[PDB]
Symmetry: D2
Subunit: 294 residues, 4 copies
């Protein structure tokens, strides 16, 4: 037997950084959860119990705080690159650093129509994330994403014309409720190293803010033929909106709302065009993914 692959690191490293402005005095908060996983010539730590090759996971935790203190934590794509670069460079047996970051929302409150200097709110469980893979002599592979963005449309969604057979009981429909938790991932074209990345910094927040706007918009305006049809259109606009991005991935759970036939009760009309009260279903759920390249 033999170590085909190995990675080890620290997970769930929760970090919080505050930016205090002098003139304005206005503070900015950033909170994230980090996980670094290392790779390289370390087999011996598994095979023969050699801890000499092991950089302690506590050390990595130490490193993460240290870095966040010396560098800017935003945007996640940068910070994750600065982070993952360090590891491969400060150590010789360390060839690949895998950085996952999850940004949490700390929106600035508006008290009395005016933005507040130092009071924030978790205005959603939606996260902004980066998977940054830093390889020695292969540059930095970034994958940005947005997740947990939960949406719902009360109509203007349809589902018919699907294959029918001896396992089909679903009835075609022209007016259904459409709900999902959006998971969108846009991969960036390989970066030489940190230098290329810093050069594109502004492109990151803009591409995330774009992907978000497209998703929302396209969700709401598309007279959905299917979830499939709606993702591709979503993808499309993103690609077309950014040359750097190489691909776009969407994984969407089709969260079902079922009509309730109340007709057994005083001939109550609650189906079809009379549908008012539905039963959201926790499960099962539809899952539909798809990667969109050029």
């Amino acid at each position: 037997s033999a170590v085909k692959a190995a990675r080890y690191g620290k997970d769930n490293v929760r970090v919080y950084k505050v930016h205090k402005d002098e003139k304005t005095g206005v503070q900015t908060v950033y909170e994230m959860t980090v996980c670094v996983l290392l790779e390289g010539e370390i087999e011996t730590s598994y095979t023969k119990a050699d801890n000499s090759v092991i950089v302690a996971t506590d050390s990595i935790k130490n490193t993460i705080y240290i870095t966040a203190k010396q560098n800017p934590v935003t945007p996640p794509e940068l910070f994750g690159s600065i982070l993952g670069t360090h590891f491969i460079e400060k150590y010789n047996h360390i060839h690949a650093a895998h950085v996952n970051i999850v940004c949490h929302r700390w929106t600035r409150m508006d008290i009395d129509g005016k933005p507040h200097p130092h009071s924030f709110i978790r205005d959603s469980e939606e996260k902004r994330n980066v998977q940054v893979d830093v390889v020695e002599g292969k540059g930095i592979d970034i994958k940005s994403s947005l997740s947990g963005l939960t949406v719902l449309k009360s109509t203007n969604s349809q589902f018919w014309g699907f294959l029918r057979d001896e396992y089909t009981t679903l009835k075609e429909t022209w007016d259904r409720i459409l709900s999902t938790d959006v998971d969108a991932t846009w991969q960036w074209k390989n970066f030489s190293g940190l230098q290329e990345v810093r050069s594109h910094v502004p492109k990151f927040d803009a591409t995330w803010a774009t992907a978000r706007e497209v998703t929302l918009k396209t969700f709401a305006e598309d007279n959905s033929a299917s979830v499939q049809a709606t993702m591709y259109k979503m993808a499309e606009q993103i690609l077309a909106r950014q040359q750097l991005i190489e691909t776009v991935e969407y994984s969407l759970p089709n969260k079902h709302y079922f009509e309730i036939d109340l007709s057994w009760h005083k001939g109550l009309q609650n189906t079809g065009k009379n549908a008012e009260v539905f039963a959201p279903q926790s499960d099962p759920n539809g899952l539909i993914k798809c990667t969109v390249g050029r």
Copy 2:
């Protein structure tokens, strides 16, 4: 041995209701989870295994669906009152109905700067809840609440002057991060029945909006001397603002962010005035609560 207390019903009934405007075409969604426990002359289903006094939890479910269909579902205070009342009246062996509604946010999307007709977003895990207790001959007791409201302030919070002894190790501070999850409940004056409740409908949505606002506002403005202090303030304004509330209750789990001393690394300064990077703590957590009533 004897049945000292009993209640049964149905929990986690997910309900979704759509309202369509024929004119504008603007649809409006509502989603809640409902729990109805019923109390009554039911000892016999426990002691003699007598199911004839039982109204199947299934039927309670159906009832919830029908009631949502034939009635307005907002404000939750109203719906809950209609729903609980039905059971005490429909059934003679049932004398109390306990109703719990958790309202889920489905805020309308803002596409291109314009409120979309039929598109919403879950803009927060925050919830609006109501606990309606309906007792035959004792009116309707309503507690209204907001929960899941997570806040954080990077400064303007202190904690010094607390009792020190041989169990203390907590260094006083004049500046600290203050984050918490807000659980605030306001309890309305007992209501005689559905009628008096309908009489005050507009008040509910308003009082809730007030309570929220009063909570963010105070939290953000107050130069906190202690979570206990900031809290009381919030309660105060709430009572002063609504005559109908008999009591306000706040439950605050203060979530700690610890500074990380990095002096051991190239003398890096990261505490006190030079504190930038902190480490949020999942546990433990302080837990402060209090009930403010009227004089």
Copy 3:
């Protein structure tokens, strides 16, 4: 406006304690999550913002560890009493102490049929808990419980004879799956103080073992007319076996498993007597509660 009530303390305090036997060499681990909520003359911390009367929540955290260090942490009923007692005795303005304890399972592994000396496994998400209320001159109130004990029986459960009306669609059944999460609580007779508690220490683990025992058996053996009937039975046995317990509370979720009519597909028989494959429902769920006391 006035502070009708206030409590505060520390929540979610994880504690782990090991017991190393010199002779045997065998080790015994204990893990739990603790919460202490304090009460007393502490309004001025809310009203006048006076941190003088505030024992810092952090100091409560310290106190927990310290206490856990000088005393045994098992049984929880005792540990909780010692800890609650301390606070009321150590502080004059502190009159009531509320202590909650959730004990996690770390069951000793059996390797090769023998009980390993220092290797444990979490063999259930089942908890054993205690809510101990220590009040100045009112004694110690102890509520012992188990929770998160998930069970199922594929037959020997029925539900029929229930009330049927225009809201009823549930078909009577003489055979169904029954699955619930057991939440069971037994309230001990009040205790003067720490001494009386220490005197009954052997009764605790005993009574919890019994409660667990009686719950499992009765759930397995009973041909269930209703979940209510079965739960009342199980409370009875518990009150009989232990005189110190004044009341027993059960709260059970009736997790439904639905039949799947597959007839529409090649006349496949899956319902009634032919039922093999079912659809466990995440929700909603029946919720049946009941507190059984002494006649």
Copy 4:
């Protein structure tokens, strides 16, 4: 732009199957959660909004139910094999079926030491799972696994000899607590089809039992030099006991238990050799993985 990848299906499909033995009487439950994503000539549904290619996820759900009702459901590798197969065959345009199955523990209850015929307990949150990719013309690929296995050992674990530098502050140790959640996956060599799988059936349940046993025992015995070192040993014995296993993957979150210095209080000694009370840490946590194939 174009469609580089696309999969679609049904997720979280709860299934429960009962087996009734007419002779003995002994009933036997199985409960699982299936997810089935399909791949094939379906690009059009995304680009040309043509649902003619789409086999409604609902039908997948129905398919799953029927399938479970017409076949045996254990061992998961068989069922998921039958199930993924069915979709490639029945549908020309579908050329890959990815089937996930999570098996839920329903362990037979022991009432008065005698195994009950129809009663069960979720004796753990441990899960047996299988991932079964079935590609048309590339046999059946089957990764087996066990997850949610939570263990802890009070001693016989050390960690010293690691690299130290200006980032290090971790003290070496010759005795520490080791606790993790074991995630162990063992891949099977590619199988030609449903007939080869069916062939080996008996291997499945047995390998799984071995993987647990190897895991359990090794963890409990190995005087651990590093998590890394103890894992590798496990992988070894697994690959050894089964020539059908192409690789073994272990994912182990190292859950930390910190010492609590209490010297500040009456010089209480709670560190090193006198460490009794510890603070379990929810986060962060070391995460150690590694795949072990053959030479």
